[PDB]
Amino acid sequence: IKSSSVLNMRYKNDKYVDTSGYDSNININGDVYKYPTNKNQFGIYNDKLSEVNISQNDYIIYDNKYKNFSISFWVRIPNYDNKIVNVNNEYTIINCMRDNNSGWKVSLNHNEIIWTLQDNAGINQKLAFNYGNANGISDYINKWIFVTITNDRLGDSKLYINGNLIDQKSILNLGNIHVSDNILFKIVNCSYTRYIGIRYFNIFDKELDETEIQTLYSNEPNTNILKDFWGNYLLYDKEYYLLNVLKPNNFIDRRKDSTLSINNIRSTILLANRLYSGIKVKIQRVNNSSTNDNLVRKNDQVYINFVASKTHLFPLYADTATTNKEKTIKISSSGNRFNQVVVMNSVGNNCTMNFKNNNGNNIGLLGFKADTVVASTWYYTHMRDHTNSNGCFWNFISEEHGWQEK
Amino acid sequence: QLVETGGGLVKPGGSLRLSCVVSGFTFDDYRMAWVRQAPGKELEWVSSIDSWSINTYYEDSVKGRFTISTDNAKNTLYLQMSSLKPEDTAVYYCAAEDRLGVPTINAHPSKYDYNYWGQGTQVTVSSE
């Protein structure tokens, strides 16, 4: 892990630096987008000058035949139309290869991530991951994907996606590998105009363990801040569509009696479910007092508002004026919060919303019953090991340019 | 298309077999239920069955006399009522709940407690 790290690209003072201790020099050439909510992740374009070049330390420039090593990062690959990207053409995004094409290379194809390793002689080996088109909800398209590559010179080279091993090939037939002095983050030879997101690039001087890859997958993003649908930080005062992870083919619509329905099947474009369907919500801080940033953290006290128009917002509340155990979620047209709050929490990328009374009493987690979105306390004792456990897990879909559906 | 049949007039102590034909979904994705409605009372849940796990659920004032059942094809729901009392004179409705929802059972359910409701069959326990 941190002991074996020889290159850690992190953000500091309007630039990117190496925090491994070997003092590698990172430079930005052109227009490199920096995410304002998380400046460690950056975007590179191909319609203009946009690249990030890492001049490695002379110590860490790989020039061995037996030393194991690993490479880790996260990549975000948008599929704007799911038609403009339908071109069989391999294009390189990360290039640590010399003039004689010795070294390593991370390239992309249509819904495909390719790893290539070549020695000084020219013997090469390739690993690949094809996640394919979306069949319902895709966990990879326009989302942050954790890529890890381990290399045992006396054994196999393995590729891991989100901590799961997916492709291993022997590299025993490769000799001396002298990688490039530079690590170039740039989109080259791409058939179309696009951008690519990269974050948390790390180089280790050993073959990473599976548990080490899992710890990296779980702790590199901030575990205290909630995540949205794409894997970015969940934001306050930001419009989001809702997605229930147990019924991913359904969306939430508004009823005339202020209740919320779930019997609405998502329309499909080819085999991909439409993401921008249903009601829109906004998260608002209860106790503002200018508490730093707009990031939604665990155990936060928030209000969930429904967006009727661009200017009109109406709080969502749990109707406790019923004999049922589960409380249906209603829209307060008057603006009355009904003396309730919502507590945010998360398991991994999935978010939970606990409706609570102001006196501290629990009303329940946000889930659904039959046709209607409700708040229920049952989810408290059945967070796992039940077919209905995932009914309280929600994803917030932000309408972005990287995912277009018309 | 939820349709119920088998209700009618019986004397105290008689027997009936209510059946409920279902079109559009199987009982593997839905939990089935029988709910009663007295003329001057609100809706009262009678019974419920899961087809994936044969665990059944009954109400206290009705257990022992009623038996809920499901056919091997999972398209027809049955309720065998025996030793009928005059308190059972009500309209009986077939109901279907999404199994993936919150599995709580309310004794006085509203219309949103189940996905689909039937047309209702009348059961009357009277002498003359």
Numbering used by the authors:
A (entry chain A): 847 to 1252
B (entry chain B): 3 to 130
What does the paper say about this structure?
Botulinum neurotoxin E (BoNT/E) is one of the major causes of human botulism and paradoxically also a promising therapeutic agent. A widely accepted dual-receptor model suggests that the receptor-binding domain (HC) of BoNTs synergistically binds complex gangliosides and specific protein receptors on the neuron surface. Here we determined the co-crystal structures of the receptor-binding domain of BoNT/E (HCE) in complex with its neuronal receptor synaptic vesicle glycoprotein 2A (SV2A) and a nanobody that serves as a ganglioside surrogate. These structures reveal that the protein-protein interactions between HCE and SV2 provide the crucial location and specificity information for HCE to recognize SV2A and SV2B, but not the closely related SV2C.
We found that G6 markedly reduced the binding of HCE to liposomes containing complex ganglioside GT1b in a co-sedimentation assay, suggesting that G6 likely competes with GT1b for HCE binding. To better understand the neutralizing mechanism of G6, we determined the co-crystal structure of an HCE–G6 complex at 3.23 Å resolution. This structure reveals that the complementarity-determining region 3 (CDR3) of G6 forms extensive interactions with the C-terminal subdomain of HCE (HCCE) via a network of hydrogen bonds complemented with salt bridges and hydrophobic interactions, while the CDR1 and CDR2 do not directly bind HCE. As a result, HCE residues W1224 and Y1225, which are part of the highly conserved ganglioside-binding “SxWY” motif, are blocked from binding gangliosides. Furthermore, we previously reported that mutating HCE-W1224 was sufficient to abolish its ganglioside binding. These results demonstrate that G6 occupies the ganglioside-binding site on HCE and blocks ganglioside binding, leading to BoNT/E neutralization. We found that the structure of the G6-bound HCE is virtually identical to that in complex with GD1a (root mean square deviation, r.m.s.d. ~0.38 Å over 359 aligned Cα pairs). Guided by the structure of the HCE–G6 complex, we designed a fusion protein in which G6 (residues Q1–S129) was linked to the C-terminus of SV2A-L4 because the N-terminus of G6 is closer to HCE than its C-terminus.
